[PDB]
């Protein structure tokens, strides 16, 4: 997260870190046994880390649980990034508490201008790299369809939306992928892609979760 603020320990209790001997992506807890992340975060060897603030120090209230299933959307396209969503099943259910909590799925899509909270442990610099120890947060609005298409002509599908800023300085960045965009208490987005980070006229692009609620429910029900 570039241009954000320190969230505060466990203030985003649905935020998880995906760890393969290092933090590589975020995700969002949606029930005690399932996490939503981005398809491009798929790999073997995923350990889900819940309850985290400082990802480099054991502080208390962490739960580390191996993934037992990692289910990429069957129609994920790694070139266009269409359908950039993955479900991870945890080997055992997380113990839910004030610091480890699920986030609700949407019942309807969000409108342009809705303010959302984007969070993660990704790079905090728009030029160069600095990875934070603690979780960072950014308040960001969903942009209009026309603004999003003007920023990324030919690249925005119906399963994507833009959020953030056009003036530069505030965005998600490398290491935030897979993590949440939460608006009015609902998981509306997954950090997906963009042209650089926090660059003028190039907002972040996010998977549009409201298009996948039935798919999520069916996939969980059958696994």
């Amino acid at each position: 997260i570039v241009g954000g603020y320190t969230c505060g320990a466990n203030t985003v209790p649905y935020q998880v870190s995906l760890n393969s001997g290092y933090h590589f992506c975020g995700g969002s807890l949606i029930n005690s046994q399932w996490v939503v992340s981005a398809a491009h975060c798929y790999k073997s060897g995923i350990q889900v880390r819940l309850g985290e603030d400082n990802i480099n120090v054991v502080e208390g209230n962490e739960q580390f649980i191996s993934a037992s299933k990692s289910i990429v959307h069957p129609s994920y396209n790694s070139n266009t990034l269409n359908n950039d969503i993955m479900l991870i099943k945890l080997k055992s259910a997380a113990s839910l508490n004030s610091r480890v909590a699920s986030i609700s799925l949407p019942t309807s899509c969000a409108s342009a201008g809705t303010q959302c909270l984007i969070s993660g442990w990704g790079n905090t610099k728009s030029s160069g790299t600095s990875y934070p120890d603690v979780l960072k947060c950014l308040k960001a609005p969903i942009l209009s369809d026309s603004s999003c298409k003007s920023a990324y002509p030919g690249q925005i599908t119906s399963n994507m939306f833009c959020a953030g800023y056009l003036e530069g300085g505030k965005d998600s960045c490398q290491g935030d992928s897979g993590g949440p965009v939460v608006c009015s208490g609902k998981l509306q987005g997954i950090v997906s892609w963009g042209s650089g980070c926090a660059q003028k006229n190039k907002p972040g692009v996010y998977t549009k979760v409201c298009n996948y609620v039935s798919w999520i429910k069916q996939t969980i029900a059958s696994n």
Binding site: Y22, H23, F24, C25, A38, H40, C41, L81, G122, S172, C173, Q174, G175, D176, S177, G178, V191, S192, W193, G194, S195, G196, C197, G204
Partner: peptide, 6 residues
């Protein structure tokens, strides 16, 4: 450009 760590 995707936003994972590589």
């Amino acid at each position: 450009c995707t936003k994972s760590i590589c």
